[PDB]
Scaffold this active site. Sequence first.
Site: not given
Ligand SMILES: Nc1c2nc(Br)n3c2nc[n+]1[C@@H]1O[C@H](COP(=O)(O)OP(=O)(O)OC[C@H]2O[C@@H]3[C@H](O)[C@@H]2O)[C@@H](O)[C@H]1O
Lengths: 252, 252
Positions: B99, B175, B180
């Site tokens: 971010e 994610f 990642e």
């Molecule tokens: N950069 C982002 C990101 N930006 C936004 Br606005 N969102 C994001 N989701 C994941 N990431 C990246 O992916 C990783 C986390 O993804 P994860 O799979 O663990 O998802 P959760 O944490 O459970 O939900 C995040 C929510 O905010 C939204 C998405 O629409 C989602 O609904 C981080 O390291 C980051 O780099």
Amino acid sequence: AAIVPTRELENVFLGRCKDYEITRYLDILPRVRSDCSALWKDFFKAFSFKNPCDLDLGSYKDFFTSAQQQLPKNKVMFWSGVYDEAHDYANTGRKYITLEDTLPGYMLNSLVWCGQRANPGFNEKVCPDFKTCPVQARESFWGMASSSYAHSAEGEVTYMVDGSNPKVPAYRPDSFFGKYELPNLTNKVTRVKVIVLHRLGEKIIEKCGAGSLLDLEKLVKAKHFAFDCVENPRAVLFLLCSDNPNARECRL
Amino acid sequence: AIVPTRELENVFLGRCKDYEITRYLDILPRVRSDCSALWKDFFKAFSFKNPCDLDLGSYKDFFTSAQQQLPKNKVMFWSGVYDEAHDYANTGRKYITLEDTLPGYMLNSLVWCGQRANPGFNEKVCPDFKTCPVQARESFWGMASSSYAHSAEGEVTYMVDGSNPKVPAYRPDSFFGKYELPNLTNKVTRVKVIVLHRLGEKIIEKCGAGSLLDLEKLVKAKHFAFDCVENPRAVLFLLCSDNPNARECRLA
Ligand SMILES: Nc1c2nc(Br)n3c2nc[n+]1[C@@H]1O[C@H](COP(=O)(O)OP(=O)(O)OC[C@H]2O[C@@H]3[C@H](O)[C@@H]2O)[C@@H](O)[C@H]1O
Ligand SMILES: Nc1ncnc2c1nc(Br)n2[C@@H]1O[C@H](COP(=O)(O)OP(=O)(O)OC[C@H]2OC[C@H](O)[C@@H]2O)[C@@H](O)[C@H]1O
């Protein structure tokens, strides 16, 4: 050693305004009436096409009248000598509003610019140390921004100070608070709540009920406001403890 | 129904310019593409297509062009814990998050979609994220994550919710699990897990057990070092600031 103005002032200013307008502080602070290019013009007429020192406190008046947002009751924070902590604690408008969350505050925060008589009307190379400029000039922009913001405060206001500086008292008439904020607080203000920040690992210099803080208590009550004062309240303490876990003051 | 961000172009442009001139200056490097070119790259990825006509490569040119080299040992990934991980990383001064990088900063919380008809994007409405197929729904943040993970060097940090009974600390489909972890290169030397135990909730996920043990094996098999801590002090203090009477925020 030479003091370099911000690149593409207009573009940056217009960039933040627009960002702000559409996406920042949506539930926290009101949008403002004037468009970004109207704001630019009020900002720019204040310094363009004059010597860099050719300013006073009237200069940005129109800018601040256009940019002034109504500010939420009981949420306004002032701060002296603790920018990092006051902002960590105000938590981006969630808990408290700072000047730097406000439109004008946000747009110009950290930026450097100054006028020149010749086209394009501002310097793009060098600005003078504003110690060379009369006070009304050095302080025209932030001084007035402080005044406009303090004049809009309502209800309870909060003031975070450094009470660990042996060279600079917690409260001073000569700070931006002391020159522009405390004396512009209106009868819509009901109370000044002071939070004294004792930096971890450091000699306690200023204490509630004493010294400059007593001078302030007095100034406050003399303005008809209720007044209170706390020294490292748990919420703030923890925040300091986050950046210095081992500090004796943070012991489990 | 979901509402697209208004003036998406100006908002993008405004953030891009503010970022380039003034943000993370001593923390992250500038990209060489100028704002307008990056817009051209971003726009071509989804414009003049069905809102749901998107794959993991739709934004490849955008990211290639927007990707910044990321400083050693500062990269943080996060899951389930946006506010704490962001408060903890402290605007790129402790760690970097996605971010904080150019692409994540320009697009954070914005809402856009394409349509086939002129002008090629939709300003009225975008589909609910669940009608749309995983690969198209994850097409923007998924590729952002891969690109950023691809750029991480040295020791990376992974902050996770250890108190969600419904959602493992580690999941092959977050994610993290999908975009990642698998894009971590030989530039990476360690994965440091920070497990966040929410104040006043049942501890669900523990280091060395469950999904965390699964993670540990996946990480080692990939020849990275591994540690994992639960509520380290710096983080605990951060949580206590928000809720100081919590049993666990107890002091001398
Ligand atoms: N950069 C982002 C990101 N930006 C936004 Br606005 N969102 C994001 N989701 C994941 N990431 C990246 O992916 C990783 C986390 O993804 P994860 O799979 O663990 O998802 P959760 O944490 O459970 O939900 C995040 C929510 O905010 C939204 C998405 O629409 C989602 O609904 C981080 O390291 C980051 O780099
Ligand atoms: N990120 C940043 N961006 C910008 N500046 C930063 C900064 N970080 C620091 Br660190 N300063 C600087 O710290 C200097 C010392 O001034 P002071 O003694 O702490 O406080 P005052 O005189 O009372 O003025 C404050 C009142 O008026 C404005 C606001 O409403 C507040 O309540 C300032 O000149 C800052 O420039």
